[PDB]
């Protein structure tokens, strides 16, 4: 639409599934990045769309790699924890998220967890996965 402000971002913000599924069937380029440099699924995670992200991860396993990263090289896990959500982070964990890929700004999760006041997510990380 211009200046990297694609309407799919606000469509995900509205949190409606029909148009999102129609666009996914049409073949939207997940490799293409917006002005912010974030992939459409990363944008959907940043918009806190549980059902849209769930559909994108379930029916597009082969379309988008679990190692695929944006320009700043971040996974959806940190962006999801940024909104303190729990159910969708458990869903992301049970999909086998990658934690062994590079990152740019180089801040870990344990150190920020000590002095950033989130408990349930980090305890869930330590409980089962490991």
Question: Among residues 45, 37, 58, which one has the least CA distance to residue 13?
Answer: 45
- How many angstroms separate the Cα of 73 from the Cα of each of 8, 68, 78? 21, 8, 11
User: How was this model experimentally determined?
Assistant: cryo-EM
The angle formed by the CA atoms of residues 33, 51 and 127, to the nearest 5 degrees, is: 95
Rg over alpha carbons for the chain, rounded to the nearest Å, is: 15
CA atoms within 13 A on the CB side of 103: 13
Cα–Cα distance, 44 to 105 (Å, whole number):
22
Resolution (A): 3.2
CB 92 within 8 A of CB 76: yes
CB 53 within 8 A of CB 41: yes
Q: At what angle do helices 87-94 and 50-59 cross, to 10 degrees?
A: 10
DSSP 48: T
Cα–Cα distance, 102 to 119 (Å, whole number):
25
100: left (phi over 0), alpha (psi -120 to 50) or beta: alpha
């Amino acid at each position: 639409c211009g200046n990297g402000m694609t309407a799919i971002d606000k469509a995900i913000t509205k949190n409606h599934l029909q148009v999102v599924q129609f666009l996914a069937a049409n073949g939207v380029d997940f490799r293409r990045k917006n002005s912010r440099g974030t992939t459409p699924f990363l944008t959907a995670v940043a918009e806190n769309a549980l059902h849209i992200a769930e559909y994108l991860i379930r029916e597009k396993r082969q379309d988008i790699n679990i190692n695929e990263q944006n320009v700043d090289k971040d996974t959806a896990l940190h962006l999801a924890v940024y909104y303190k959500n729990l159910q969708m982070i458990k869903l992301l964990i049970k999909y086998g998220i990658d934690v062994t890929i590079r990152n740019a700004y180089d801040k870990t999760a344990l150190d920020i967890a000590i002095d950033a006041k989130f408990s349930n997510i980090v305890e869930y990380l330590k409980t089962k996965s490991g």
